[PDB]
Design an enzyme around this catalytic site. Structure first.
Site, PDB file in Angstrom:
ATOM      1  N   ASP A 278       0.828  -1.204   0.000  1.00  9.82           N
ATOM      2  CA  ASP A 278       0.000   0.000   0.000  1.00  9.82           C
ATOM      3  C   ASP A 278       0.865   1.258   0.000  1.00  9.82           C
ATOM      4  O   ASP A 278       1.375   1.664   1.043  1.00  9.82           O
ATOM      5  CB  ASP A 278      -0.921  -0.005   1.225  1.00  9.82           C
ATOM      6  CG  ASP A 278      -1.803   1.228   1.312  1.00  9.82           C
ATOM      7  OD1 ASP A 278      -1.869   1.977   0.314  1.00  9.82           O
ATOM      8  OD2 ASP A 278      -2.445   1.435   2.382  1.00  9.82           O
TER       9      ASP A 278
ATOM     10  N   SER B 147      -0.574  15.623 -11.927  1.00  4.34           N
ATOM     11  CA  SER B 147      -0.827  15.273 -13.308  1.00  4.34           C
ATOM     12  C   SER B 147      -1.071  16.526 -14.137  1.00  4.34           C
ATOM     13  O   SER B 147      -1.616  17.519 -13.652  1.00  4.34           O
ATOM     14  CB  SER B 147      -2.023  14.328 -13.402  1.00  4.34           C
ATOM     15  OG  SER B 147      -2.430  14.151 -14.740  1.00  4.34           O
TER      16      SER B 147
END
Length: 330
Positions: free
Chosen positions: A35, A199
């Protein structure tokens, strides 16, 4: 040193991925959920409330000759999906795909919430976010990667998650045969303890690319792709019959639909998520309404590039003095 381990989807929907991990002496192999959105290595154990164990493999520290109780240490964690777990702490030897850390904090669960009990395939979590998020008290503990870093050939690990198929986690090296083209690296902020990046935008299907900054985290422990409401609305508007359902808890779409791809920007580069990756199947057994793999982050408070996004890429988690993230197509 290096390590390399195969990671396997837990079910036909790729709801999560498990990776075998050797703990203790002799080895006890547990299948853990790696994770990159958390920083605790915790396991089902001989100490877990018996009624909260349902088919998982347990760590029994009394059977490990290298296990040592970390005196006075406890841990307690709550995840974005509302699940939680807590317990005490051992140090022990932990190996992943041939890479060994001695003295790793292994957090032994005394309590786990129902969603963990109900998932027989996940024996615990292995956190790979930054050690600043580790919940051990009163002395915070380091992640497996943090402990291994100095010994690795290169201070990196990579995630290569499969679509309905096995994939690979590598530590300490970049497998140049595992991706196509080049790896594009992008800046990371560690201020919230995550692999947080920005992004450069998105496209829906064959549509034009929208240049827009989207701050979010690279999180292997989250199944879906959570993005701003504007972006998610633009995606699902291209799917006939798709709607946001408050009763189901997100966007649903007719199971007969063919989904468009979703592209996200990494600098000037582009990662394309095929439409099929965005289908998470009937909302309930036998239903013709299907759950979408792209959902709104509104009210999460952060955008999350979860498995839906990451499995479309070869992803480098670069733990150099100044961390960065790399993405390549594959």
């Amino acid at each position: 040193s290096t390590g390399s381990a195969t990671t396997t989807p837990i079910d036909s929907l790729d709801d999560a991925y498990i990776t075998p991990v050797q703990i203790g002496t002799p080895a006890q192999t547990l299948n853990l959920d790696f994770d990159t959105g958390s920083s605790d290595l915790w396991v089902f154990s001989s100490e877990t409330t018996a009624s909260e164990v349902d088919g998982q493999t347990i760590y029994t520290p009394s059977k490990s000759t290298t296990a040592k109780l970390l005196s006075g240490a406890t841990w307690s964690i709550s995840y974005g999906d509302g699940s939680s777990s807590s317990g005490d702490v051992y140090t022990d030897t932990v190996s992943v795909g041939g890479l060994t850390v001695t003295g790793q904090a292994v957090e032994s669960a005394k309590k786990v919430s129902s969603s963990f009990t109900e998932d027989s395939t996940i024996d615990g979590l292995l956190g790979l976010a930054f050690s600043t998020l580790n919940t051990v008290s009163p002395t915070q503990q380091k992640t497996f990667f943090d402990n291994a870093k100095a010994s690795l050939d290169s201070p990196v690990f990579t995630a290569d998650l499969g679509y309905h198929a096995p994939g690979t986690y590598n530590f300490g090296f970049i497998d140049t045969t595992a991706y196509t083209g080049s790896i594009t690296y992008t800046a990371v902020s560690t201020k919230q303890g995550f692999w947080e990046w920005t992004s450069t935008g998105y496209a829906v299907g064959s549509g034009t690319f929208k240049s827009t900054s989207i701050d979010g985290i690279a999180d292997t422990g989250t199944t879906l792709l959570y993005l701003p409401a504007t972006v998610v609305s633009a995606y699902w508007a291209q799917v006939s019959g798709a709607k946001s359902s408050s009763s189901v808890g997100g966007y649903v779409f007719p199971c007969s639909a063919t989904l468009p791809s979703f592209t996200f920007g990494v600098g000037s580069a582009r990662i394309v998520i095929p439409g099929d990756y965005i289908d998470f199947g009937p909302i309930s057994t036998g239903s013709s309404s299907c759950f979408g793999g792209i959902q709104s982050s509104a009210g999460i408070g952060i955008n999350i590039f979860g498995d839906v996004a990451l499995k479309a890429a070869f992803v480098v988690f670069n733990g150099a003095t100044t961390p960065t993230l790399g993405f390549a197509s594959k």
